[PDB]
Amino acid sequence: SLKITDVDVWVVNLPLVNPFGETRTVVRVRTDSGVEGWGETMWGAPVAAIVRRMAPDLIGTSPFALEAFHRKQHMVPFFYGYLGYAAIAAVDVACWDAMGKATGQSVTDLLGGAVRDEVPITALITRADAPGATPADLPKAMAEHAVRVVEEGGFDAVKLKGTTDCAGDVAILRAVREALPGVNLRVDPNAAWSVPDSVRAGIALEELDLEYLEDPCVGIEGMAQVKAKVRIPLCTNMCVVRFEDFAPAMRLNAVDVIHGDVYKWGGIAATKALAAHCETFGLGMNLHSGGELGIATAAHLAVVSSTPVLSRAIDSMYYLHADDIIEPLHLENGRLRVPSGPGLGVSVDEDKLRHYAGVN
């Protein structure tokens, strides 16, 4: 039968360090077989509250009954939005971990098997990296920092956090590109630019051959307008964040690349599904990072490892991790190695978990 006996939730605070704090919700699914599954998702109090309100509904169910579980909680995201999907995702991941353990198989092998064993990641640079720089000096300052990060980290891709200062972002990107001719370069204004400014800036950025322009403006409508004029692949993890957004986005030709994210889409199967959708519509795909630590990153690595279309250097703030409730993942020369053991391939230190829950 394999039934779930307990669902426990902890909210923890872990330190972060830039080699060049954060709050997360952790969930444990216990089964009458002795097998335990772990999951980690974003934020604390509010997400932890949603999971506990769903816990009673999981007692007595099989961790293998994910389809039944998701259908049962389909209205949760309707009311709780992003946090709803994130709460669901934590439970989703814990069940997959439990499934791998119950079958003695890696989550990767339960998702189709590995097609790649190493997962390249991206280096994020923000203006906060050049505190002293003045407007006229900021570009050179960022380029120098970019070069340092790339050589010290071995990153295949670099991503700039854009601001409402379009002209300034463009100035920075030009400097970075001139200093790093062969790196995959991206910019993410987080929908801070207006459509008219996105077109003007986009046109100016075409000569830099960026891997993609990420969320320059808000909405499917605005994004479609940018795509119609700017000759740069357009990416998003803001205007298409659920399947209900997919069909409309495709009919309006709003994007060229979509960012997957288990914690944003509610689970592993949904993300594998999204990968299928992207291939069908000739869209590129990558994964977005919302501060995942070891457990969460492990789930993502299993997805990337078993998914052909995820051939790009993913976004990952995992290189900022210090102490974690599990053993450090293998991050070397800009790439993360996909864990090998049963389930997610990670072991959780409960003492530390209890410790960091007290910090929170």
Side-chain angles (χ1 to χ4, degrees):
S1 302
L2 192 42
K3 290 171 174 178
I4 296 178
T5 50
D6 302 284
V7 181
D8 294 298
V9 195
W10 292 268
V11 174
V12 303
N13 287 359
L14 283 74
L16 294 171
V17 175
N18 175 38
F20 309 104
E22 179 177 272
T23 295
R24 308 288 294 189
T25 289
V26 184
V27 176
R28 176 184 63 200
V29 173
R30 179 192 301 299
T31 69
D32 55 14
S33 80
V35 163
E36 294 182 350
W38 294 83
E40 175 212 322
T41 194
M42 79 188 288
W43 291 31
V47 179
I50 300 174
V51 183
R52 292 179 181 130
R53 284 190 173 182
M54 295 190 300
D57 288 309
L58 289 150
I59 301 306
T61 64
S62 169
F64 283 93
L66 287 179
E67 289 273 9
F69 170 60
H70 285 290
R71 293 289 292 180
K72 191 169 184 54
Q73 312 299 327
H74 79 292
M75 288 301 281
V76 172
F78 181 67
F79 297 106
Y80 293 101
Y82 196 170
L83 303 197
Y85 284 113
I88 290 175
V91 178
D92 183 87
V93 176
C95 288
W96 274 98
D97 186 39
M99 281 173 248
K101 293 179 177 180
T103 59
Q105 301 290 171
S106 60
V107 169
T108 300
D109 275 343
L110 293 177
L111 299 174
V115 288
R116 65 176 63 75
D117 63 317
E118 291 301 311
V119 180
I121 63 172
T122 310
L124 171 70
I125 57 174
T126 77
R127 295 188 176 197
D129 288 319
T134 75
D137 296 320
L138 180 52
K140 196 188 201 66
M142 297 291 281
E144 273 168 47
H145 182 66
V147 174
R148 292 293 124 184
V149 177
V150 175
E151 74 190 342
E152 302 181 322
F155 296 98
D156 308 322
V158 174
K159 171 174 166 290
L160 171 68
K161 181 177 185 297
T163 68
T164 55
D165 169 33
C166 315
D169 297 336
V170 180
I172 292 174
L173 295 168
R174 284 169 174 165
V176 175
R177 170 58 78 203
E178 203 182 79
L180 294 171
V183 76
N184 283 308
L185 188 58
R186 314 163 184 171
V187 55
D188 189 348
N190 290 294
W193 303 342
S194 68
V195 180
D197 285 318
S198 291
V199 176
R200 288 181 64 191
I203 292 176
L205 296 171
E206 304 186 322
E207 61 177 4
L208 308 179
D209 187 39
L210 310 172
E211 176 170 22
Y212 54 69
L213 176 46
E214 197 180 321
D215 290 307
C217 63
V218 303
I220 290 175
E221 171 56 31
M223 290 288 274
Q225 290 297 323
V226 177
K227 182 147 138 63
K229 282 282 173 73
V230 177
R231 307 179 95 197
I232 305 174
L234 204 65
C235 181
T236 194
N237 65 60
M238 290 179 73
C239 76
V240 173
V241 305
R242 60 182 192 151
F243 288 103
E244 287 93 327
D245 296 340
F246 202 85
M250 297 298 94
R251 286 194 188 292
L252 297 180
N253 297 296
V255 305
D256 303 296
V257 181
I258 298 180
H259 263 301
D261 178 356
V262 170
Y263 310 103
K264 183 178 283 259
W265 291 67
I268 290 181
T271 301
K272 294 289 291 188
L274 181 47
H277 281 61
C278 290
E279 300 188 316
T280 297
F281 281 90
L283 302 181
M285 180 185 196
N286 202 9
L287 290 187
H288 169 263
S289 171
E292 296 71 44
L293 294 176
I295 300 175
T297 296
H300 272 350
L301 293 172
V303 176
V304 174
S305 180
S306 62
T307 309
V309 73
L310 288 168
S311 60
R312 300 156 179 264
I314 68 172
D315 276 352
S316 173
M317 286 331 109
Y318 185 66
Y319 60 75
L320 297 176
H321 91 83
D323 198 31
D324 206 335
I325 59 182
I326 75 167
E327 290 281 285
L329 300 174
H330 195 290
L331 170 59
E332 183 194 328
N333 182 44
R335 311 187 300 167
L336 283 166
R337 185 169 68 197
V338 189
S340 53
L344 295 174
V346 302
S347 181
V348 184
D349 184 315
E350 279 166 42
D351 299 317
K352 291 190 170 185
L353 170 65
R354 204 177 52 262
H355 172 67
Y356 290 110
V359 186
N360 176 66

